[PDB]
């Protein structure tokens, strides 16, 4: 119907919109990632998340609302859009999930040093070859300071960075 280039660009922008929505609200529900399954007359979207039992809602109401939002937005018949929720092993393999975890920890009021150290220790138990956490901004100070913690080896350049790392 319309051009394939614009079609897949809209695919990308819709992916960005849904990722922004998920990371904006489902973050405190342990949201980690999404992948869109395209099927004739069906849009399956998968979600591997950490706090699945509390993102689910009592008898699938929140999942129903997430579904029916985009359903009514693109005049889908109910059931055509479907989102599935699973839990992945080794939750430390989710940079976004760890990001939102210590993000909430800051608004809770934990110490930055201890909190970041706990995050990096959780990751080291998860089994990362290298972990690196930088916190930048005001640290009981009126001048912006940037500080970092690291363990293991952390490659900084190359397609090994483009693929193997998580940021």
């Amino acid at each position: 119907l319309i051009s394939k280039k614009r079609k897949l660009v809209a695919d990308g922008v819709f992916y960005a919109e849904l990722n922004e929505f998920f990371t904006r609200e489902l973050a405190e529900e342990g949201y980690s990632g999404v992948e869109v399954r395209v099927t004739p007359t069906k849009t399956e979207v998968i979600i591997r998340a950490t706090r699945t039992q509390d993102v689910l809602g009592e008898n699938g109401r929140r999942i129903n609302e997430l579904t029916l939002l985009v359903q009514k937005r693109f005049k889908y018949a109910p059931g055509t859009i479907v989102l599935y929720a699973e839990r992945v092993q080794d939750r430390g393999l989710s940079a976004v999930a760890q990001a939102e975890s210590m993000k909430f920890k800051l608004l809770n009021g934990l110490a930055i040093r201890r909190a970041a150290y706990g995050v990096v220790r959780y990751v080291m138990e998860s089994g990362a070859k290298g972990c690196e956490v930088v916190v930048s901004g005001k640290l009981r100070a009126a001048r912006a300071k940037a500080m970092k913690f690291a363990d293991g080896f952390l490659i900084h350049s190359g397609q090994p960075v483009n693929d193997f790392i998580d940021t």
């Binding site: 395209v38 099927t39 004739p40």
Partner: protein, 100 residues
């Protein structure tokens, strides 16, 4: 009835294995066809300045998107095309079927 199945994805390995298994299915189910016609990789180049503001050296970067396109013509029965649509479906590849 004189349909065309085309694949316009950007996942190169998923496209490759999709084409491979579709070819294997067609050959093993004895449907005469010509090989998957392969189109030139369409590259989309979008050039953008790094700096949000107007400062810094006049540095540039070019974001690139790649598109691989394949198509195959099938003259195959209604029940068998229903079977092909409903099975051997592999995600990650945007595959669409038209007629003529």
């Amino acid at each position: 009835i004189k349909i065309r199945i085309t694949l316009t994805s950007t996942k190169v390995k998923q496209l490759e294995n999709v084409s491979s298994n579709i070819v294997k299915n067609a050959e093993q189910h004895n449907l005469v066809k010509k090989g998957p016609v392969r189109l030139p990789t369409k590259v989309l180049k979008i050039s953008t300045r790094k700096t949000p503001n107007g400062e810094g050296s006049k540095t540039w970067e070019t974001y690139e998107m790649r598109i691989h396109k394949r198509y195959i013509d099938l003259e195959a029965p209604v029940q068998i095309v229903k079977r092909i649509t409903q099975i051997t479906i592999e995600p990650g590849v945007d595959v669409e079927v038209v007629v003529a």
